[PDB]
Amino acid sequence: KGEELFTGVVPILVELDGDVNGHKFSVSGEGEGDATYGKLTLKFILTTGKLPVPWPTLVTTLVQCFSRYPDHMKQHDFFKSAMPEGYVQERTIFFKDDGNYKTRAEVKFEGDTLVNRIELKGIDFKEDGNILGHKLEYNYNCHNVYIMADKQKNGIKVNFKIRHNIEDGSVQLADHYQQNTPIGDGPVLLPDNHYLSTQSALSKDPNEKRDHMVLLEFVTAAGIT
């Protein structure tokens, strides 16, 4: 069973290749996950290109197998059930009054390392909008992530709204539509409706001179008694 792979601290590797309105960039991330506590600690580094979008817009794209599932909800944990062969995670993210991201990622083990490999494509962004104009605060709010089974597709459908804080005190909405599908042909857990309570804190490494993001996250599954 996939959940056995998560009982301890697991090293994480993240690789993202991005293209937003033709602005090409790559990001790498390293850290570790402790699903028993719902805890993620990651540092992301810009590796190539000028970062054309605010770091907060990339948090959801940059490993929901690290969520803490209560014992009474263990039969609802699709994400760990797909391991080690992994799952494909696809999203469309609609930035209100702006462009969209489309993402496709594969999340799987490579030995002891949990790897998230992502392609991100952004189109129809406004030159002087909040995204390409870099008008978003470097912070992050708590959100609920809503999960339902997609039995006909042997996976899950996920939806949620991210509210990014604009520097003028307003809000940039980012509406997320997400699908996850197993990579392997073995059984997975198809859940009853529930959500993930997702806390994220963004910070900087004072000794890091590359453009980067340090992220601390706590995620707990809920909504079934």
Q: Assess contact for 24 and 16: CB atoms under 8 A.
A: no
> How far is the C-alpha of 196 from the C-alpha of 158, rounded, in Å?
10
Three-class DSSP labels, the chain:
CHHHHHCCCEEEEEEEEEEECCEEEEEEEEEEEECCCCEEEEEEEEEECCCCCCHHHHCCCCCHHHCECCHHHHHHCHHHHCCCCCEEEEEEEEECCCCEEEEEEEEEEECCEEEEEEEEEEECCCCCCCCCCCCECCCCCCEEEEEEEEHHHCEEEEEEEEEEEECCCCEEEEEEEEEEEECCCCCCCCCCCEEEEEEEEEECCCCCCCCEEEEEEEEEEECCC
* Locus of tokens 């062969």: 85
> Residue 31 in 3-state DSSP?
strand
State the amino acid at position 18 in one-letter form. G
> How far is the C-alpha of 70 from the C-alpha of 198, rounded, in Å?
15
State the amino acid at position 39 in one-letter form. K
Set out the domains of the chain in order of their start, with CATH numbers: 2-222 (2.40.155.10)
Method in brief: X-ray
> How far is the C-alpha of 132 from the C-alpha of 186, rounded, in Å?
42
Tell me, in Å, the resolution of the deposited structure: 1.5
State the amino acid at position 145 in one-letter form. V
